[PDB]
Design a protein around this ligand. Sequence first.
Ligand SMILES: *[C@@H]1O[C@H](CO)[C@@H](O[C@@H]2O[C@H](CO)[C@@H](O[C@@H]3O[C@H](CO)[C@@H](O)[C@H](O)[C@@H]3O)[C@H](O)[C@H]2NC(C)=O)[C@H](O)[C@H]1NC(C)=O
Ligand SMILES: *[C@@H]1O[C@H](CO[C@@H]2O[C@@H](C)[C@@H](O)[C@@H](O)[C@@H]2O)[C@@H](O[C@@H]2O[C@H](CO)[C@@H](O)[C@H](O)[C@H]2NC(C)=O)[C@H](O)[C@H]1NC(C)=O
Ligand SMILES: *[C@@H]1O[C@H](CO)[C@@H](O[C@@H]2O[C@H](CO)[C@@H](O)[C@H](O)[C@H]2NC(C)=O)[C@H](O)[C@H]1NC(C)=O
Ligand SMILES: *[C@@H]1O[C@H](CO)[C@@H](O[C@@H]2O[C@H](CO)[C@@H](O)[C@H](O)[C@H]2NC(C)=O)[C@H](O)[C@H]1NC(C)=O
Ligand SMILES: *[C@@H]1O[C@H](CO)[C@@H](O[C@@H]2O[C@H](CO)[C@@H](O)[C@H](O)[C@H]2NC(C)=O)[C@H](O)[C@H]1NC(C)=O
Ligand SMILES: *[C@@H]1O[C@H](CO)[C@@H](O[C@@H]2O[C@H](CO)[C@@H](O)[C@H](O)[C@H]2NC(C)=O)[C@H](O)[C@H]1NC(C)=O
Ligand SMILES: *[C@@H]1O[C@H](CO)[C@@H](O[C@@H]2O[C@H](CO)[C@@H](O)[C@H](O)[C@H]2NC(C)=O)[C@H](O)[C@H]1NC(C)=O
Ligand SMILES: *[C@@H]1O[C@H](CO)[C@@H](O[C@@H]2O[C@H](CO)[C@@H](O)[C@H](O)[C@H]2NC(C)=O)[C@H](O)[C@H]1NC(C)=O
Ligand SMILES: *[C@@H]1O[C@H](CO)[C@@H](O)[C@H](O)[C@H]1NC(C)=O
Ligand SMILES: *[C@@H]1O[C@H](CO)[C@@H](O)[C@H](O)[C@H]1NC(C)=O
Ligand SMILES: *[C@@H]1O[C@H](CO)[C@@H](O)[C@H](O)[C@H]1NC(C)=O
Ligand SMILES: *[C@@H]1O[C@H](CO)[C@@H](O)[C@H](O)[C@H]1NC(C)=O
Ligand SMILES: *[C@@H]1O[C@H](CO)[C@@H](O)[C@H](O)[C@H]1NC(C)=O
Ligand SMILES: *[C@@H]1O[C@H](CO)[C@@H](O)[C@H](O)[C@H]1NC(C)=O
Lengths: 488, 77, 485, 68, 103, 99, 97, 105
Amino acid sequence: LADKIGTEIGPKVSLIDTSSTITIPANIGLLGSKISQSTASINENVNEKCKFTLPPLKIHECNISCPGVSNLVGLPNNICLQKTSNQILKPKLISYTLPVVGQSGTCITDPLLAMDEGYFAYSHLERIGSCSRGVSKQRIIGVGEVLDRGDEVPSLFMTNVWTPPNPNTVYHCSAVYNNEFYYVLCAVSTVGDPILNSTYWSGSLMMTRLAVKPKSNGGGYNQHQLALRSIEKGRYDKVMPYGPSGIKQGDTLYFPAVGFLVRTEFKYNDSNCPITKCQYSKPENCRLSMGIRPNSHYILRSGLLKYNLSPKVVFIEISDQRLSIGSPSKIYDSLGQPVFYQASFSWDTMIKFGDVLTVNPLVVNWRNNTVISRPGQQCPRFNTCPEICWEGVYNDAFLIDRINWISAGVFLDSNQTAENPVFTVFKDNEILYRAQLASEDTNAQKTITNCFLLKNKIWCISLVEIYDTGDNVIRPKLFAVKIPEQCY
Amino acid sequence: GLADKIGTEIGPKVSLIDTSSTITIPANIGLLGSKISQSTASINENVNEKCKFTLPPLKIHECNISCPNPLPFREYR
Amino acid sequence: GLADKIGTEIGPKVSLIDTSSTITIPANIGLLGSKISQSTASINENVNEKCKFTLPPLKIHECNISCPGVSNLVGLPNNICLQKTSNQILKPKLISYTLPVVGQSGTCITDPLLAMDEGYFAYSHLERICSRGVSKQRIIGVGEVLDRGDEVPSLFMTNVWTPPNPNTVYHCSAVYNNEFYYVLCAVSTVGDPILNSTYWSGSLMMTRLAVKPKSNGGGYNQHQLALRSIEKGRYDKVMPYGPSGIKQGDTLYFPAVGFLVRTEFKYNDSNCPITKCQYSKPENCRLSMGIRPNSHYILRSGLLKYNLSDPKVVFIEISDQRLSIGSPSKIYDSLGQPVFYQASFSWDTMIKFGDVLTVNPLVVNWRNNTVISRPGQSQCPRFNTCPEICWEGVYNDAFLIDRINWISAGVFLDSNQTAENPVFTVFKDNEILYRAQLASEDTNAQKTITNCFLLKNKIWCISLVEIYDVIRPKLFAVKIPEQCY
Amino acid sequence: GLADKIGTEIGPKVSLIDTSSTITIPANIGLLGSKISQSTASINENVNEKCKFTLPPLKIHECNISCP
Amino acid sequence: EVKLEESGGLVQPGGSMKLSCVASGFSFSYYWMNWVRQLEWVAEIRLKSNNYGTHYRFTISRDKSSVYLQMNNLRPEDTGIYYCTRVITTVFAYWGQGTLVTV
Amino acid sequence: VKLEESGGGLVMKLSCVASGFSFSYYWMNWVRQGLEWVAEIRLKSNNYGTHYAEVKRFTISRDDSKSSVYLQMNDTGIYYCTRVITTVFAYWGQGTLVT
Amino acid sequence: IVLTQQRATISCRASESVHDYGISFMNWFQQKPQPPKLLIYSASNQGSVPARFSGSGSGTDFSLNIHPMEEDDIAMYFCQQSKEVPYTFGGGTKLEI
Amino acid sequence: IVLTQSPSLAVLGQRATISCRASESVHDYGISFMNWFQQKPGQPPKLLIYSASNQGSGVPARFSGSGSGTDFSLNIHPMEEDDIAMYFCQQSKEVPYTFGTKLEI
Ligand SMILES: *[C@@H]1O[C@H](CO)[C@@H](O[C@@H]2O[C@H](CO)[C@@H](O[C@@H]3O[C@H](CO)[C@@H](O)[C@H](O)[C@@H]3O)[C@H](O)[C@H]2NC(C)=O)[C@H](O)[C@H]1NC(C)=O
Ligand SMILES: *[C@@H]1O[C@H](CO[C@@H]2O[C@@H](C)[C@@H](O)[C@@H](O)[C@@H]2O)[C@@H](O[C@@H]2O[C@H](CO)[C@@H](O)[C@H](O)[C@H]2NC(C)=O)[C@H](O)[C@H]1NC(C)=O
Ligand SMILES: *[C@@H]1O[C@H](CO)[C@@H](O[C@@H]2O[C@H](CO)[C@@H](O)[C@H](O)[C@H]2NC(C)=O)[C@H](O)[C@H]1NC(C)=O
Ligand SMILES: *[C@@H]1O[C@H](CO)[C@@H](O[C@@H]2O[C@H](CO)[C@@H](O)[C@H](O)[C@H]2NC(C)=O)[C@H](O)[C@H]1NC(C)=O
Ligand SMILES: *[C@@H]1O[C@H](CO)[C@@H](O[C@@H]2O[C@H](CO)[C@@H](O)[C@H](O)[C@H]2NC(C)=O)[C@H](O)[C@H]1NC(C)=O
Ligand SMILES: *[C@@H]1O[C@H](CO)[C@@H](O[C@@H]2O[C@H](CO)[C@@H](O)[C@H](O)[C@H]2NC(C)=O)[C@H](O)[C@H]1NC(C)=O
Ligand SMILES: *[C@@H]1O[C@H](CO)[C@@H](O[C@@H]2O[C@H](CO)[C@@H](O)[C@H](O)[C@H]2NC(C)=O)[C@H](O)[C@H]1NC(C)=O
Ligand SMILES: *[C@@H]1O[C@H](CO)[C@@H](O[C@@H]2O[C@H](CO)[C@@H](O)[C@H](O)[C@H]2NC(C)=O)[C@H](O)[C@H]1NC(C)=O
Ligand SMILES: *[C@@H]1O[C@H](CO)[C@@H](O)[C@H](O)[C@H]1NC(C)=O
Ligand SMILES: *[C@@H]1O[C@H](CO)[C@@H](O)[C@H](O)[C@H]1NC(C)=O
Ligand SMILES: *[C@@H]1O[C@H](CO)[C@@H](O)[C@H](O)[C@H]1NC(C)=O
Ligand SMILES: *[C@@H]1O[C@H](CO)[C@@H](O)[C@H](O)[C@H]1NC(C)=O
Ligand SMILES: *[C@@H]1O[C@H](CO)[C@@H](O)[C@H](O)[C@H]1NC(C)=O
Ligand SMILES: *[C@@H]1O[C@H](CO)[C@@H](O)[C@H](O)[C@H]1NC(C)=O
């Protein structure tokens, strides 16, 4: 019996999962790409071949010689724009088309989801054992298409999947779509998370260039990796990518990032620390809390990484308007202009995002939002008093209506803990409507919101890290939410 | 009866799954990819044969022309 | 508690995975291929209809100016090697891996079927748990013959049907007609009608499979027909018997055998070419008509005619020229004319096939073939031409590839006493032009079915050969060479 | 240690395989089939709109007429 | 044995002749029939499945395992030997004995 | 968001200075006052394309580095500088008099 | 495209439809004896506007619905077509108590 | 499509070659449509070669041939007494179908 299990069954099961989890999905993804490539070829063939004009014609002796899915674009897509209490959002789970659900022995951490021009990038880290301490098994980074399924719902179909040679050295990846490629910029580290171990981090970056329409023999096309040392840090000692997505401007890629600045090189005026309206706050706390502890060596300052495709990385710091600790950021292109979101892991717990007035230097007209705020413990939801903490979750919001500045995303509706994810649509000083994604006693962490237009209707795909009630681990779940025009 | 389960309930199915997953499924996907390429070629060929139109200069003086304040027409000789 | 883990955590999952991997996924892949084929036709039709135009009147200023891959082997004189040589110019590439014909453990694949027409194929086999055992399942399905990336034909299935009980389905035969592949099967509660004929009910059923199925086709994809009327004439019972048939307009002709009562059947002991054999007696020419000299019924070959515009099925008798025991047979649509092949399990061991002169009655211009002969037991061994009482042999096809020289191809077993050493050959009535082995000489083989067609205007033949290793089928895609070097 | 192979090597893999074979693989195939239909519609729409043979009104006051 | 036998061969100019070819040894209904005169091709007739389409004063027709050529408004230029032929996949593999026609 | 028109008076070259938003990402339009649209100029991503009311005498131009838009008029009423956001004239300045 | 113009309403009718991309490109503005202020953009969607202002329509037929109309709502109102360039406005109407 | 054939061939035991030139190519499908026949007084023409190099029924090994495009030929070797005959090339690809040389010792 021992030999049959180890010789007749084991080896076959091992070969089977390789085939079913890697090679078959890969071949299907490629097959789907071939469909897109043929469609484009056929349409081009017709456009070029069936183009015609009338011939030169004669009068007697004289001859006459004559001379599915897109991003949010500047289009007045309508949404419900009234405060209501009815149930008008109806979330769909589309996670079933991605390789996100594995065996009960693993946990999925550090998800990424980004979208542009009908294409998406997606990634996650698979760990064995505990979600915070388990050894990495693999990191899956790949791209695909946003497709229309027969139910008139969006669905994510992967076409090109890349994995690193060492899953335990890849951290804080960000991605930008440009010209049928999706550039993923990752930090390389041999000391674990660069945020927690900033003093022994080597500081190098790597970029993975993936095709969104791969070829069967595209050995040097489907995927390519670049090592990056040509980094212009300016005043910063170290520079790292830090956020799920960025934007393109022509042939320039802008990724979300954080600079590591030694405290002695950091300048801040204590008179700008908002103690005036809080009796327990200290004016000095606004500087101490710029790191992940009072005695950290480096301060985390937000910014962008500018990579030129016509080929070095330039760190662009964010200005100090409403200056706070660098936490994962997101810059996205919405309705004609870049919008910047920055997570808050410090004393200012209000959602912090706004219109990008300029990219270099980065200046953001932060919205004065007083109804959306992150959960916390020292730094609880809706807290505005300077304090020393480093905690919190990333919960972004995507702009879906610029004229009246309405954005949507998933927030955790509890002021003491990270639980009870709800999809909301809101105004800076009001919440219009919402729908619960998981129950009150269900815990959740990171959420990523990406919106697009499917046949002229607004859809938002919200990735939410939700704890299961079985083995108590997190799995990204994709809630496809349609934003209704009517308020009923 | 652990030996019986492995030999009768698991073995006979794991082996078949292995064959299907590593040979017949990939083979059909590959053939299906070939079908896409063949369909593409057929469509482009059909367009080439059916949409490659061009014509010589027209003779206005031999065409039926209708104008404001038209002239009478009897014959072309 | 390990037994519980295996039976509760793994067992149920292995069972579900097996169902999904061997049935559901292949079915979805097949249907996906169909959707692509259907859309291709739709797109071409759209172009054909929309890109057709006449010049418009041209308005100038104020004046309106009104101014004046795989196809059947039919119709082409294809180039082949037709000289006798002794080199290796055949390339028998194996394509069986694309079909669900690869078994495992004690899984026997027997009684295979393979038919081709207009770029489509039908395939069938019975899976058993190979002499005597329990039937697992009967798999019958259709698909397309595709151009593989390396210019090798390959079989891709799109539509698979199974019966509720495989132990009742025998001797199915397929005919392609109007994008459906009709399969005529004998239904029996006594097993194979050939051996248990005295208790066979005589009923027949037909399955109509779409070769280009729809996702919700229902009866479109797998229609179940029954034959309420069988015109037997003088026969007590009739059945389908052989690989494939032909289509003529809306009429389908299936290979068949009739069961005639021995005492009604007549023969003439003075009208048999027995005078050339010193070790026989005249009654052997009549007793050989049964599976034993004292059987109730005898077997006589013919066709079952099915008219789609009627429907009844009609049994058509054959001429008595070279009359032999009804054996599995095939009718081809080849190079412009129907060709009939009949296996010989009778004393006449020579290959028996030729052009069809008439269909009803079926009259065949049997070829004067003096070279090709099937293997058999010492009672009726290879190349035997002496009337003797026996009943045994194998089916060896011979598809016509070039009519002008009457050159045909198929797989024959190169052995006198046993069914061994399958060799793909190209031959003439009085010659073998070239040969290539599909297995070693020590490997045995049984039924061989050959279907030839054009791929990119070149002749290819796919030979389905039962090769022992439990016995499993192998499918060899053999290109027919243009040069003899 | 029979349970060690079942518990950590085979069990977990069979569960992983089940998810891929019954959910993600057929989901992608079904979704792809929808994509085939989308591609078909795109091609037919392109032909219907672009292969249409028609002419605009012509003005020839801007044309050069070559006379003997 | 495949054979084609022609009969119906002097007719004065302006008159007419009909050549009758008797086919045997093969399935007449499945093969294209042609007439050739001596070499010059004269006429072709296709099968029932091709709606008896023809290619070429003369009319070609089929029935009796036989093919006929109707030659009306005859001229001296038509003098020669007419052969009944059978075509297998475009090749004139079989020829009859031939009948002499004089005008 | 502020749009400040100038260059008006009795005769014309009008100008508008933008503040509070990023000028370079929006379409700029001139409307005169019922209300009549006069001209539109787009940004670099649209290759600085322009459109004119069938005034089509007038030239519209912009300079992103100065966050401003200009209208050269080579007609009496109040000219307004507007921002077109997702095709909607959501923002208007106070306007300048042309006479 | 030509545009022709307690509870009170203002109607506007287009010579051609303004519906495309699933959107009816019919905007409404309020102008006090001031620059025009956006009330509604596209059919039935309020701008950055008291709840008393609403509206609806499709194709060629659109209307602005004001309820209640107050003393400070006395103004010129205009309908605008934004599907095509050149952009067009209706002549405008005066609504008063 | 019409054919030009050349040379009379005053050629025993020697190789005889006869050429035929098509006005248009006759090689669709990769299949030559240039056929060759042997004809003797009192007899109908007999098929020798169909397409390129493919011998007809009962045709001696002495008869071969080759060609492509518009350039085709018949190769007879060795020529024997029984090979004295008229030889013809045939265009069987398109309607009208068309067609000689004298080969002797
Ligand atoms: C931040 O990264 C640094 C550099 O990798 C970490 O320091 C390293 O920690 C390892 C243990 O995990 C040390 O290896 C051990 O050294 C002792 C001798 O002291 C030996 O007995 C052990 O068998 C093992 O080899 C390594 O020497 C040490 N390197 C340096 C330069 O200090 C640091 O712990 C990381 N900090 C955090 C919070 O992750
Ligand atoms: C395999 O058998 C052939 C011939 O078949 C046998 O002999 C016939 C006369 C007849 O009785 C059949 O039923 C038998 O099965 C053998 O070929 C013959 O060999 C002899 C001796 O060289 C020769 O004189 C004959 O002319 C040959 N006949 C033919 C048709 O070839 C062959 O040698 C046997 N091979 C083996 C391996 O046993
Ligand atoms: C990205 O690199 C390209 C390199 O060509 C830059 O384009 C040049 O920019 C300079 C101004 O610094 C001009 O004088 C050149 O004429 C431009 N060259 C071309 C070919 O256009 C581009 O500006 C860089 N972009 C960013 C954001 O760094
Ligand atoms: C121009 O108009 C004349 C009629 O005035 C057309 O003449 C017809 O020609 C057809 C043959 O093509 C005849 O069968 C009709 O009987 C004729 N009509 C009449 C009334 O006699 C002529 O064809 C037109 N030419 C063009 C280019 O449209
Ligand atoms: C022919 O068919 C008959 C009927 O099925 C077979 O006889 C039966 O055999 C089973 C045992 O397998 C008995 O239980 C039945 O009672 C028998 N029925 C009758 C009517 O006798 C018979 O064995 C078959 N002949 C052969 C050679 O297989
Ligand atoms: C093989 O040869 C036999 C003769 O031994 C052929 O039989 C003759 O066929 C012709 C043509 O149909 C008939 O007219 C004769 O009457 C038949 N002869 C006898 C004795 O019946 C047979 O048809 C030939 N078969 C092939 C394929 O060539
Ligand atoms: C008609 O003929 C005139 C004369 O050749 C063409 O005039 C040319 O126009 C181009 C474009 O502006 C100038 O660069 C050339 O210098 C002009 N030629 C001369 C001699 O002045 C005119 O373009 C032609 N029109 C058409 C429709 O072909
Ligand atoms: C109208 O254009 C045609 C172009 O095909 C002119 O024909 C050619 O004119 C050139 C220049 O004189 C000659 O060299 C060619 O030999 C002419 N071609 C032929 C086939 O004769 C035609 O002459 C022009 N018509 C007028 C009135 O100028
Ligand atoms: C900091 O702010 C105080 C305000 O009283 C000012 O006097 C001081 O000069 C400022 N220092 C710097 C470096 O800006
Ligand atoms: C938020 O309020 C500040 C004043 O404290 C202002 O400068 C800023 O522009 C406001 N944000 C927006 C988007 O208007
Ligand atoms: C969170 O704190 C706020 C304080 O403004 C309170 O109104 C709300 O009810 C509290 N909710 C929970 C779950 O503690
Ligand atoms: C040209 O045709 C149009 C219809 O397309 C018609 O209205 C017009 O009157 C015609 N012109 C003349 C001169 O008849
Ligand atoms: C049929 O048998 C008789 C003998 O009873 C014989 O004379 C006759 O010739 C046989 N028929 C044929 C065709 O040989
Ligand atoms: C099939 O039935 C139709 C309709 O009666 C008939 O015309 C046709 O000839 C029949 N087919 C055959 C082969 O008899």
